[PDB]
């Protein structure tokens, strides 16, 4: 309803079924989402991983090219723009379809790219034939007031990378994502965790359905920094829409941590 | 009951209250728990943290000799042979009360000290004023057929600690532990992931009562490989007995995530 006493940021999550190829279909509903959130006063969107042209590494690989990820991206910032919301989208790299990786993006809601990132920990066999590891840390910056940062799907089950982002001194961690297989543990047990263990908030949006030969679990979920849910999802498509309101972070001994890895 | 088909490995948890600055009595209750655990057939048996002085560090360091430590580490050692099982304790260190932190040792069922550890992660500025915090990884060691580690309550709480940990081979890590305050989110949370995300086996052996001024949680557990309980206490004393039965550990990328932290 209307926007709480206590709170400044509401953010929205969108979770869906994207087909696979098509990416006019996947920006269409990205647009339409957009469009709901903005309309619900939500400041910024949310939405999964490589959604634009579906959750299919090999095929991105072997029929996607640089110019058509550009295409989308264009689409994109002009879907942030015309949507006056902020949106993080997540698709190929620029480079060709030899060189480049899963990415994540925020625009904010004048279409501005604030901050960019090549997702470093990939998922499987497919991913790494299609795909170049990132090799560099989550970017955090300021943006309506809190400190975001943006890791990929399977980044997140890595303490490691969200304790990258915690030291730069991320609060909000946006995270598009794609999982299959009815993975609860990684919504129902390491992202809790993950929130918990750098005093954060994390935001996950999720695939929900039948795409590319798999059936994604939904369970989209905002969490906060004690663990709790501030929002689920389903597995059915829908949009979250979610208002935000010892320390481990300082007490680590991270120079000794960092040679016992 | 009966030992099952399919486990070779049974272990004990001793949960219960210490009375401060009176070690004959709390290694009495240890030699009593570590009889029990061993007429169920139980080969090891995890004892919480500090158990032989209680937890009350201002006072283990005013008032505790390192001759009296060593008379208890004497003791324990004894009971570990007398009782024919291996036994993992915590005490001060053995250097003098302004030099030595907090430690887990490990002795087998002959009474010989397989491993030592001293606590890296102190928790909270009794403890940082009471102790030396550690300078060395968890150590890893082949007993019963598996690879056991040793870590300190506060560490576990940690990723870092039990990934430096499960790095070293870990399948079974073993904590005493102090959790007072129903920080739930301890066990609840934290302890289930530590396990998912390493793919190991955690025991975690806490006090459970009035005891130096806190009141602490019990709740001791042991959590397998699926962030499950294989089995759990409550608030009052008692002697848990348990049959033991994505590939993180080698996708993440540690030489990028040793440059994050």
Known sequence: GLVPRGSHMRIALMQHTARPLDPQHNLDLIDDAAARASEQGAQLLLTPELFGFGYVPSQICAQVSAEQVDAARSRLRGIARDRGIALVWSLPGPEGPEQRGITAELADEHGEVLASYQKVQLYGPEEKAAFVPGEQPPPV?????????????????????????????AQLVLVPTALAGDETSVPGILLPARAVENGITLAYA????????????????????????????????????????????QDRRAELHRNWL
């Open 141 to 169: 910056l300021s943006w309506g007031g809190r400190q975001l940062s943006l890791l990929v799907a399977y980044d997140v089950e890595f303490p490691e990378m969200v304790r990258a982002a915690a030291a730069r001194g």
């Open 206 to 249: 999720n695939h929900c359905g039948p795409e590319g030969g798999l059936v994604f679990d939904g369970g989209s979920v905002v969490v906060g920094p004690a663990g709790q849910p501030l929002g689920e999802l389903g597995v059915e498509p829908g949009l979250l829409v979610v208002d935000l309101p010892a320390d481990y972070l």
